[PDB]
RNA sequence: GGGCCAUACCUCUUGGGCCUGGUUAGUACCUCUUCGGUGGGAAUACCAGGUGCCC
């Protein structure tokens, strides 16, 4: 159990990512940050870091074999697929 | 149409994917270590909640 000791704090997390995230709320700053080259995004959980990171590996089209398209976002992937792949 | 880049989609059900909490577990495994200590950290299984926001 990892135990947050901020000034009269004093919560129990069950694991440590979980106490780093609380205690970016007592400073008012974000510890899961993007170390993409050119980026600067930062996360509140380490999951969302990661899903963050899916950005940069992009979105690949998958609705037909002889499709090549991958989306630089989830949103251009959707876009493609409902112009591309609509039946 | 743009930004955040799925709690956004998929499927039509109290389901999948993705997100959160309690348990297996901060255990197993792995870095550094004067072995005192340190940082990352599962799988597999069980239970509960959530399903876009801004211009
Ligand atoms: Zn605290
Ligand atoms: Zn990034
Ligand atoms: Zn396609």
Redesign the pocket.
Known sequence: ??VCHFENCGKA??????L??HQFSHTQQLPYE?PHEGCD?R?S????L???E??HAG?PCKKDDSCSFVGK????Y??H?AECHQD
């Open positions: 159990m990892y997390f069950k694991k440590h990512n979980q780093k995230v993007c995004k996360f959980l380490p999951s969302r990661k899903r963050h899916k950005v979105y976002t989830w949103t251009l959707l876009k697929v």
